[PDB]
Amino acid sequence: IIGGEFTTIENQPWFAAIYRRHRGGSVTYVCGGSLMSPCWVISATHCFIDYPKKEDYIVYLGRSRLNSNTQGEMKFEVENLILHKDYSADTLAHHNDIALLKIRSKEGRCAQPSRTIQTICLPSMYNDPQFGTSCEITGFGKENSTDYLYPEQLKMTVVKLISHRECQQPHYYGSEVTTKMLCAADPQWKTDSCQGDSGGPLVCSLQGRMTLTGIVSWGRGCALKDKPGVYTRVSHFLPWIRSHT
């Protein structure tokens, strides 16, 4: 997250921190995610498509720092990794960039809701907020495009939703962004998601309820003029999400 503010997981309790074990024992951060139901986390297929082996992945809930065991966190392995069957990656644009990870503790259990661990509600069909609506993002991604390290502490920021026809203008993304994708950015281009934030939540308060409207997917640069963050539009995928869970 470029700019924004440092935060802690009690403000973001549906946020999943996903890591990968490498041959030889080293572990590194991979992508964020969101808890949809006790046994199910949703993220982006691009985070896993090159290493599609469920056994390589560690999922934490209730964790606030990249290298510290926060009081009250739980650790999980992946029972099932489900990648969307029609996913593809163009130059910029990612297509059907959604995935489900069925989670399980070493004792065989799903998550147990607590003060630092909670689900986020999914959207309803044909019901997204209007362009101009403020929404929040969370992640452990880069603070600056020229950094190679990620922040130790969880960050968050707020951005505004942008219409399909504005995001399809020539200096934005043209015909590369489709009706299955949602654009959001800072009007002043000073804050955004960046590398390392992928798969994480775009949450919008809609008719009173906090809703998982988007999933961090792709962008040109970070916090660059006329280049919004692009998000997987969750409401399009309600039939897929339903049948695979």
Summarize as ranges the residues that interact with ligand UI3 (CB under 6 A).
142, 145, 192-195, 198, 216, 218-219, 221-222, 229
Q: Is the CB of residue 172 less than 8 Å from the CB of residue 6?
A: no
Choice between 42 and 222, CB closer to ligand UI3: 222
- Rounded CA-CA distance 4/190 in Å is 9
Sign, CA dihedral 166-172-174-178, equals negative
Choice between 50 and 107, CB closer to ligand UI3: 50
Of 56, 97, 128, 192, catalytic: 97
Residue 239, C-beta contacts closer than 8 angstroms, at least 6 positions apart: none
Q: Is the CB of residue 61 less than 8 Å from the CB of residue 16?
A: yes
Of 34, 43, 46, 192, catalytic: 46
- Rounded CA-CA distance 123/34 in Å is 13
Residue 243 known to be catalytic = no
Q: How far does Cα 46 stand from its chain's mean position?
A: 11
Q: Shortest Cβ distance from residue 178 to ligand UI3 (Å)? A: 16
Choice between 30 and 101, CB closer to ligand UI3: 30
Q: Shortest Cβ distance from residue 25 to ligand UI3 (Å)? A: 25
Q: Shortest Cβ distance from residue 44 to ligand UI3 (Å)? A: 9
Q: Shortest Cβ distance from residue 162 to ligand UI3 (Å)? A: 12
Residue 198 known to be catalytic = yes
Q: Shortest Cβ distance from residue 157 to ligand UI3 (Å)? A: 11
Q: Is the CB of residue 180 less than 8 Å from the CB of residue 167?
A: no
Choice between 202 and 241, CB closer to ligand UI3: 202
Residue 95 known to be catalytic = no
DSSP secondary structure string, 23-59? TTS-EEEEEEEEEEETTEEEE-GGGTTTS--GGGEEE
Residues listed for the chain: 245
Residue 113, C-beta contacts closer than 8 angstroms, at least 6 positions apart: 38, 119
Q: How far does Cα 99 stand from its chain's mean position?
A: 11
Q: Is the CB of residue 144 less than 8 Å from the CB of residue 2?
A: yes
Q: Shortest Cβ distance from residue 1 to ligand UI3 (Å)? A: 10
Of 43, 64, 193, 198, catalytic: 198
Choice between 117 and 184, CB closer to ligand UI3: 184
Choice between 74 and 185, CB closer to ligand UI3: 185
Provide the annotated active-site residues: 46, 97, 198
